[PDB]
Amino acid sequence: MAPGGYVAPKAVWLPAVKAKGLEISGTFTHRQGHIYMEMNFTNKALQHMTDFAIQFNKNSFGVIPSTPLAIHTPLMPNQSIDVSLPLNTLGPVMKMEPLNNLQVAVKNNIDVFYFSCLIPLNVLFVEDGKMERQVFLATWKDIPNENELQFQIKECHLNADTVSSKLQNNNVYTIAKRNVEGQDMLYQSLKLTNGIWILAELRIQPGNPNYTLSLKCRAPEVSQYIYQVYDSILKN
Amino acid sequence: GGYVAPKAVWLPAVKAKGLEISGTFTHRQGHIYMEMNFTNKALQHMTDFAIQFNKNSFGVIPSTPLAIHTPLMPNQSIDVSLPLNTLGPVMKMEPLNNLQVAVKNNIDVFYFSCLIPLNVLFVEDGKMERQVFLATWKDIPNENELQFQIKECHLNADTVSSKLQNNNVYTIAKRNVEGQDMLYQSLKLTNGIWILAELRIQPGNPNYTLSLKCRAPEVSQYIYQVYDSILKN
Amino acid sequence: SFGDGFADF
């Protein structure tokens, strides 16, 4: 566990085979307020690479780079560079499918290449995500039960204290806890970069290698993606 | 006539040893064309032009060889109209409507990609029966429903329908609920995909909500984009 | 634009 929270390992986003020798692998981070696309560019061609630039298609959460890609030295054959690209969420918005899809165009001196990758939604959980208890109860009551979606986190053996701590490290806050007949119930909140609040109730059972995650959100389409995030945080 | 995008420089001269290609796509009387402007910015004359498309999402392929017989002189340009069909080999592209192209002349072979606006692939026979619309809209899982905003549109419902009809997007029903207009629309792609749409127009809201349902929901953003372009042009 | 190659940049 690290400050900033869970970072997935880099995955190959653009194979050298699809980009005339250019290989790009990447991941996303959220560190001290700022979001980054952390990439490694590798030149697997026999000629050097220059004139690098990046653009993102419009996307669900308005993600966009905050600065141009600035690689001021030519990327030599077989050379590899780490690139940290700061991002913000004030860019143009277009609904993606899947919801967290990000389409990226990368140009060098050779051509323009395209790829997509999936933004893990945890990088879009804001620090300001701790709901007031009074507001949680009222909001949970009001939100129609049509919006409630349930998930199972399976093969998890952490206690309620450690679950709470790991989730808090990722801006998911536990604002209340209730213990009824061997079962821990954690009431939790988080908030995304676009203002959407998600309310969670997490239930922990003994003899049960799996927890029940119940999510309520006025935009319920995000819920399944929030689940995948919880699972990753608690399995890692 | 439907929406035609302004030509864009698909191939700048400095990337193709003097060869510059400007282009757009058109759909005229049931025929698809790649409309290109070839300019010779080199010092040498150009001959032996030929074009090839890589496999692509919608099976787009030229219907004939490019056939430029007359040589192209330095600083001279020609406007070419290349007829296309959708019976070619298929491969899913990223983004979906990106097309990989190679153009050859006497100097070298050059590679570029361009954007196919999906309206050129909207077929004339795209008016759905109301009965089938209603049953299909209900049956398609709501997880396949995607919603977009057409922002700061200054068009009334009737101009919206007419513009869209000129692009083979059919309004099969128009319903008023509590002041709010709801336009129910259909279109079909050259590959047989039907898209169902509901456009909500609320008086006092210049932002219209477009809801799309399709059994291939991945096409939706591309439909929205050309839909937006049609109403802004 | 997005998807229009060199014209994107």
Numbering used by the authors:
A (entry chain A): 702 to 937
B (entry chain B): 705 to 937
C (entry chain P): 1 to 9
Quote the original article.
Adaptor protein complex 2 α and β-appendage domains act as hubs for the assembly of accessory protein networks involved in clathrin-coated vesicle formation. The C-terminal “appendage domains” of the large subunits recruit interaction partners from the cytosol facilitating their concentration at sites of coated pit formation. We identify a large repertoire of β-appendage interactors by mass spectrometry. These interact with two distinct ligand interaction sites on the β-appendage (the “top” and “side” sites) that bind motifs distinct from those previously identified on the α-appendage. We solved the structure of the β-appendage with a peptide from the accessory protein Eps15 bound to the side site and with a peptide from the accessory cargo adaptor β-arrestin bound to the top site.
F2 is surrounded by N758, Q804, V805, A806 and Y815 where A806 is found in the base of the groove. Mutagenesis of this site confirms that Y815 on the β-appendage is a critical residue presumably as it π stacks with F2 and H-bonds to D8.
